[PDB]
Amino acid sequence: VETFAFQAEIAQLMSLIINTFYSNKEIFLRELISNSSDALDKIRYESLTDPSKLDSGKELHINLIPNKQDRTLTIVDTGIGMTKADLINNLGTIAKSGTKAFMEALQAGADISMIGQFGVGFYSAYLVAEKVTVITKHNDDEQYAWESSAGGSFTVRTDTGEPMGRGTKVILHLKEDQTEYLEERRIKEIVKKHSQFIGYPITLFVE
Numbered sequence: 001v002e003t004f005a006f007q008a009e010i011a012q013l014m015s016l017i018i019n020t021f022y023s024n025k026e027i028f029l030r031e032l033i034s035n036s037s038d039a040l041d042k043i044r045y046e047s048l049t050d051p052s053k054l055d056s057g058k059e060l061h062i063n064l065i066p067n068k069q070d071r072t073l074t075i076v077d078t079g080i081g082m083t084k085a086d087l088i089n090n091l092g093t094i095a096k097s098g099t100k101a102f103m104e105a106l107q108a109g110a111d112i113s114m115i116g117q118f119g120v121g122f123y124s125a126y127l128v129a130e131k132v133t134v135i136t137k138h139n140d141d142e143q144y145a146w147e148s149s150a151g152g153s154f155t156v157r158t159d160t161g162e163p164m165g166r167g168t169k170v171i172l173h174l175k176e177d178q179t180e181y182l183e184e185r186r187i188k189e190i191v192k193k194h195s196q197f198i199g200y201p202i203t204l205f206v207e
């Protein structure tokens, strides 16, 4: 297991997301589904000229898996996946510059829900999760697990879990007071509100 420090800017972003009073937490799901959609677009586009890139799985979809026993909401996609380097490099984001812009925007009247316009929507996971685990597999690399409970550091390790084939799994270990996001009615409502036109099937698993 390798432990890394977040860059100062990202640690600051995470602290802001965790400590700022902001009731409209449900946008985290929109942001994560948007990331999955982007990753699905990328593998789709690459497959247009090289169909072998789908040898690791032809289906392009998003699954939402609540588990009330474990208090986890998991978002699974079969998009392009991230390399180890991507994970370490802020989950494939322009986190330093994006955070800078987001901060200035918040002073220019913006609110936290606009975080995706600054390329760092992933971190909205911390609106509802005390810990986030990201398991990912890119065609050109091995399967890795990234994890962080904030507090300035994250870990990366080779994943020993179920082989994914290709794509990304985000496991949200929910805060005790955020269990509404495990309720079928609530998830359906949020997907319909914010993700109605996403171009991949979104399947909400039941328990």
Ligand SMILES: CCC(=O)Nc1onc(-c2cc(Cl)c(O)cc2O)c1-c1ccc(OC)cc1
Binding pocket: 032, 033, 034, 035, 036, 037, 038, 039, 040, 042, 077, 079, 080, 081, 082, 091, 092, 093, 119, 120, 121, 122, 167, 168, 170
């Ligand atoms: C497609 C992008 C890319 O090159 N590679 C990716 O491969 N997998 C993911 C991914 C990342 C997260 Cl955090 C997720 O929740 C779900 C995902 O499938 C991304 C990705 C998506 C949006 C980004 O910035 C907006 C940066 C990276």
